[PDB]
RNA sequence: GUCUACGGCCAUACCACCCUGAACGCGCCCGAUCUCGUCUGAUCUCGGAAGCUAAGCAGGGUCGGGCCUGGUUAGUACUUGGAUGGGAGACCGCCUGGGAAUACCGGGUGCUGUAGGCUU
RNA sequence: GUCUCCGUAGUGUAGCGGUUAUCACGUUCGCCUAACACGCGAAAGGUCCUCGGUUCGAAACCGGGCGGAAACACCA
RNA sequence: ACAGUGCCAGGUGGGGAGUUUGACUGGGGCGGUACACCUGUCAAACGGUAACGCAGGUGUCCUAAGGCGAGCUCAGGGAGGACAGAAACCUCCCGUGGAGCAGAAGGGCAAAAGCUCGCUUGAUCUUGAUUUUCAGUACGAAUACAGACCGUGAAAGCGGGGCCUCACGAUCCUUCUGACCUUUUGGGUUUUAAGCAGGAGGUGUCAGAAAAGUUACCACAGGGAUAACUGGCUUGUGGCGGCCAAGCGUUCAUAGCGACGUCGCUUUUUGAUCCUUCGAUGUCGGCUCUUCCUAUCAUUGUGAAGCAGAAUUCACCAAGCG
RNA sequence: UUAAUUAAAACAAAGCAUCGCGAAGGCCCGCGGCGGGUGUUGACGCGAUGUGAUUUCUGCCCAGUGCUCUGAAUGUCAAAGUGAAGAAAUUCAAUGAAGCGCGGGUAAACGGCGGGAGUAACUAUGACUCUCUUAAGGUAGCCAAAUGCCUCGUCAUCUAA
RNA sequence: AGUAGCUGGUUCCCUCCAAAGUUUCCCUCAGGAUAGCUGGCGCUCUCCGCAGUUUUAUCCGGUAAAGCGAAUGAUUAGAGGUCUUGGGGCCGAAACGAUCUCAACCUAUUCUCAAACUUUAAAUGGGUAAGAAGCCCGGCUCGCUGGUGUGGAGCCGGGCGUGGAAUGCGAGUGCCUAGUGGGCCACUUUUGGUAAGCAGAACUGGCGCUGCGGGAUGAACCGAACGCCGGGUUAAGGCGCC
């Protein structure tokens, strides 16, 4: 026999059960996707961060 | 059902404005993005790359990554129950600044100058904003003028 | 679909870019021998009938061309296989377009 | 031939005209929209009544054809062949569909073009005529008589336009007299205070 | 007052027609040896400096079209939320908030950045 | 009703994306015969059903109409 | 020395064996494909959103219709010029795109994304990230980069296919390409074979079984998720009844009728639907028997006629009796 | 003849007509053999089909599907065997049983047996003609037949109907 | 003891929490896997964070409405021009000569429209921000970028608490997990259909799982949600008699 096809009804009712919650947010954040580039200096500079200790 | 097109549904979404076709302005592409920038997506029909998915359009991210066209953008989207920090590359023609914190920087500045300047007077200045309140009792003048007495007119079949 | 029966194009060997030779790829036949062919016989035999599905409801009509490049450097003569998109009719070196002629 | 009126009273469907995807409409009942003197000119026929419409329905081609037959023929008869022009005001563009009968049943239910109606507003007028002042009396008739064509609920007014045009009577004599307007036929063209000066020069010339 | 080179916003800058343009510019303009390109030195490229604001260009004008911006349209149309409101219905009124668009009427007609000129 | 298919000189009919639109009968002219018929030499005649579209070029290829003809319409 | 027999091999082989004989679906079948995709709409101004909803397209095409650069400007129109005419080619002028960009549509595009030339193969080799569908899996397609090699241009740059939104395919197996590659079992050489990485051969029921019927001789498990009666909602169709009044009725709209229109009622027609019943509600018609309705054919009492009489027609109270 | 819902028009039948076979055979059984049935048989026989007494007749079609007949003349064609290459495994080649293809026969084998247009001095028909067409284009008969939808066909008879 | 995605059954009490009929894939459509919805076990903190809400800023949109003397498409009526074309005429020796006359054309108007039209353009709505993960200083690293000690990123040290809108509320996090995967109804919006107690969607709320007062009666309406009681008062509804 047929039956029903779709829907979204109770569907944000089910949601909101356990509440909508927003992305977790850390004061640090991967660097993921950055530019390959970019991120290659970037550990080059971290990496001879200890030459100028003594300066600072 | 729908199609699973990628840009069903984007007619208008996408067009371009009425008499603003045609050639992009430069200082579209001058604008400075730095990573941590608030920018608003809203996708342009003239170019093709980069284009932002129709999801994004309307939405407001920050930008992490910059490329020499492009920039990465952490956009949240909600799916059904929950709220993904989706990452987008997105061509610098389909953002623009959002001025959303603009106004947010201004206030810190101006509640930074008046919280120092206040402390060197010694007194004390309200820094927080405040809901607009009650209007406050006040006088209203007539000047000798009897108010226009309203009525309310006759029905008229103006058909 | 015509293609040119020459094109530089990259050569892993030689490192650069060189010229090719393009010809179509063409199924080697079968082996006897290959370990799966050999399964094969072996499942095949004596009793109990078809053993492995025979494949029947068809529905491609074209192929994807595969183009055998050869790398014209005498030393090298790397090869290479490039498919291209699905197409019913395919030539090679054919004669090219022209522009603004008579179509007698 | 056709279901009765009532299958099709209300707008229950969103506008269909007959266009590229809508094919194979049949022609409307109603192909003449104005009847009676169309050349008179807009001083000759200052009165105009209307037929409005009190309901928000749908007036099949059919009931618009025979209203203007029934309104036509009384003022022909009341106020001669020359007395009066008549202008039905609607236009049925709304296509109506039939999905028809003997079995598929529900399958494959959407119909074939049937005929047209016009879809009317509350307010909305039906059909106009204007004729002399003291032919009052017979547009109110004619119009009364006209109203037992349609379903639904109409009121005849009286309007206070001059004629067909969009201009007050207790104002129209003075703006033709200022130049304000210019006969036009069975309209007034309005002469605005603008534009280059040698039209100005024109009409008062 | 203003221009030239390069611009940003991209008609308040556009379009049509008319008037006026000092100086410097920008031009029109005069040639084809060279560079370069053409059926054609018209265009493009190159070498110039007799003439002219005629044109482009700039400024101004038009009860100008457009465009920009207000008013009216109008607290109208539409609309969020409410009722054991009305009405056979179609639909409508009221309560609580938001709130348009034509026609019609008025006003305006580029601003400005960098660098370099002219203008006692 | 669903499905399939077809419209070409007056008649019946071919047309393997570029034809001087095939074939036969038919019609007109001239010979032959005293005359008809048969026979021989010539000629004319297609709204390629209609509208639209792709194509350098559509009778043909693709959609919509207008006529028409087959095949189905079963279990109660 | 063959018949024949034993064992192999090819053919034949519904005589016999086993098995299959899709799904969706206003019942099923027939018909379609709404089964994998794409455009506009539905869709209610984020996104998403269904029906065998609406209008369409797809399984291709392209050595250029890919890439770069330069130079040009299109559809249409006006006015002129031998043959030349509606339409050939030449010239000037207007031209915001009314053209073209392979195709469906939508978007985009004017010293360009179109047209024409010159040179070319970024439609090449390579690792990750991301987007779309989404379970935040796969495929497919697409987006930013990064590393090589290149093309083009004076250069800035642009290009790793087609201006964008579609144009496609797992495991197992086979085939090709790649390495001074690994293994090939006690060691060594060599053929072979198997590995590793990347393409292709295909599953369109498109996340991918290998598949014809008939049963009225039929079977089992179920189903009122589902058809064939009644009943229920609805009333298109059927039936019956009004309203307006152009006409008919010699005359005269309405004695009696009545077009074009339009408003209803009924459930004694047929449909539409699938709510009840498939651990069964006995399926047509007649016969017989009772009862009820009125939308009245007759009869009682009446009103109106184009009611002289007779006959007839229209209407009223009216279902007692036929 | 369907024991226990069908007694029949179904089945059989004589008659008729085909088909195989001369025994190392035809047809059939059987796991098996110097096995078995027909067969204590021999073509006036045995085996396999169709039709269904008598009477009269049994038309055309061998394109299709079957069956059947001819075959080195001869395309494809397994194993084995032969030849060559190689270290061998292996590869290649030549050769070529039946069967299929190829060609005949056959319908009392399964089966099949058209369409359009014009035309006779009133109308109607249309013997006649042109044309497209298949392997034949339904012949002798017979029919609203137990076979005809339309259909309760049309005419006549049978009835008051 | 064949298999059964199918029918039937499945045995004591109280206490606490409490669903789904939806997403994607499946020879998937009476069934599974999958996410969602539930329960249980906790654990990490607390006595800043968060929110089915508004406020203030800031973006996004093309529906309702409107418009068509604005583009596309459809569509009615006249009016003025008209040789730039035609039909009727009409005087001729006849031509663009004359004469009219009706159409096509052009120009300003005019009636009426659009789910697959649009210049405009709401309400409701969707993102983002409203601080210490901030702000402001000084320095250091870089193979990235580069006229420039330029830019960009990272890192180190230092100073700033009026914790920078309202309101409310303790939060975060991890394992294991059952049933469900036939729904149906109503306000509003909405597709097909003549319509249907019909089929199909959006939003929210219900019934399903739920009694109770009222609507005589009734899954869904109106009120209101439930431990066992006494008193008071109410809602929606009522107050002739029952
Ligand atoms: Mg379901
Ligand atoms: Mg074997
Ligand atoms: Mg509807
Ligand atoms: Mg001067
Ligand atoms: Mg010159
Ligand atoms: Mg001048
Ligand atoms: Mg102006
Ligand atoms: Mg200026
Ligand atoms: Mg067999
Ligand atoms: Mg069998
Ligand atoms: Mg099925
Ligand atoms: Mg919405
Ligand atoms: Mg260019
Ligand atoms: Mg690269
Ligand atoms: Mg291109
Ligand atoms: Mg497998
Ligand atoms: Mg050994
Ligand atoms: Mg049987
Ligand atoms: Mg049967
Ligand atoms: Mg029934
Ligand atoms: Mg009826
Ligand atoms: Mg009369
Ligand atoms: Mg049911
Ligand atoms: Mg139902
Ligand atoms: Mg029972
Ligand atoms: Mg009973
Ligand atoms: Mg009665
Ligand atoms: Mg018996
Ligand atoms: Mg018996
Ligand atoms: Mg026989
Ligand atoms: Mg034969
Ligand atoms: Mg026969
Ligand atoms: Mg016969
Ligand atoms: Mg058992
Ligand atoms: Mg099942
Ligand atoms: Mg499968
Ligand atoms: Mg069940
Ligand atoms: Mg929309
Ligand atoms: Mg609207
Ligand atoms: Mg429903
Ligand atoms: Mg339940
Ligand atoms: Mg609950
Ligand atoms: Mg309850
Ligand atoms: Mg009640
Ligand atoms: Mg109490
Ligand atoms: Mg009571
Ligand atoms: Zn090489």
């Known amino acids: ?56 | 059902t729908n199609t699973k097109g990628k840009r069903r549904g984007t007619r208008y979404m996408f067009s371009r404005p009425f008499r603003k076709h045609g050639v992009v302005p430069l200082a579209t592409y001058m604008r400075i993005y730095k990573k941590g920038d608030i920018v608003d997506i809203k996708g342009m029909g003239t170019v093709q790359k980069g284009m932002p998915h129709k999801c994004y359009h309307g939405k407001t991210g920050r930008v992490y990554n910059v490329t020499q066209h492009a920039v990465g953008i952490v956009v949240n989207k909600q799916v059904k129950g929950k709220i993904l920090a989706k990452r987008i590359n997105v061509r610098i023609e389909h953002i623009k600044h959002s001025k959303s914190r603009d106004s947010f920087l201004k206030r810190v500045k101006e509640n930074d100058q008046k919280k120092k300047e206040a402390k060197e007077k010694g007194t004390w200045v309200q820094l927080k904003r405040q809901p607009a309140p009650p209007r406050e009792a006040h006088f209203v003048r007539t000047n000798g003028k009897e108010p226009e007495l309203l009525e309310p007119i006759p029905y008229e079949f103006m058909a | 679909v015509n293609v040119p029966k020459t094109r530089r194009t990259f050569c892993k060997k030689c490192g650069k870019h060189q010229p090719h030779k393009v010809t179509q790829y063409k199924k080697g036949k079968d082996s006897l021998y290959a370990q799966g062919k050999r399964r094969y016989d072996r499942k095949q035999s004596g009793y109990g009938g078809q053993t492995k599905p025979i494949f029947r409801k068809k529905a491609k009509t074209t192929k994807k061309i595969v183009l055998r490049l050869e790398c014209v450097e005498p030393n090298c003569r790397s090869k290479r296989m490039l498919a291209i998109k699905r197409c019913k009719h395919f030539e090679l070196g054919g004669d090219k377009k022209r522009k603004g002629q008579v179509i007698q | ?205």
Not at chain 4, 108 to 114: C, N, R, S, V
Not at chain 4, 140 to 160: D, N, W
């Open chain 1, 1 to 56: 026999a047929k039956s029903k096809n779709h829907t979204t009804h109770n569907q944000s009712r089910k949601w909101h059960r356990n509440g909508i919650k927003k992305p977790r947010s850390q004061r640090y954040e991967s660097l993921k996707g950055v530019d390959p580039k970019f991120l290659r200096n970037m550990r080059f500079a971290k990496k001879h961060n200890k030459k100028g200790l003594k300066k600072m």
């Open chain 4, 1 to 205: 031939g056709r279901r009765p009126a009532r299958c099709y009273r209300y707008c229950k469907n969103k506008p269909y005209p007959k266009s590229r995807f809508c094919r194979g409409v049949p022609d409307a009942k109603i192909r003449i929209f104005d009847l009676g003197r169309k050349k008179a000119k807009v001083d000759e026929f200052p009165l105009c009544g209307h037929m409005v419409s009190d309901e928000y329905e749908q007036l099949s081609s059919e009931a618009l054809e025979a209203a203007r037959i029934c309104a036509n023929k009384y003022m022909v008869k009341s106020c001669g062949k020359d007395g009066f022009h008549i202008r039905v005001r609607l236009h049925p563009f709304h296509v109506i569909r039939i999905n028809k009968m003997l079995q598929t049943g529900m399958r494959g239910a959407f119909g074939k073009p049937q005929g047209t109606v016009a879809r009317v507003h509350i307010g909305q007028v039906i059909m106009s005529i204007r004729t002399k002042l003291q032919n009052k009396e017979h547009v109110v008739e004619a119009l009364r008589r006209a109203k037992f064509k349609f379903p639904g609920r109409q009121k005849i007014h009286i309007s206070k336009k001059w004629g067909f045009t969009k201009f007050n009577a207790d104002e129209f004599e003075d703006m033709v007299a200022e130049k304000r307007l210019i006969p036009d036929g069975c309209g007034v063209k309005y002469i605005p205070n603008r534009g280059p000066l040698d039209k100005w020069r024109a009409l008062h010339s």
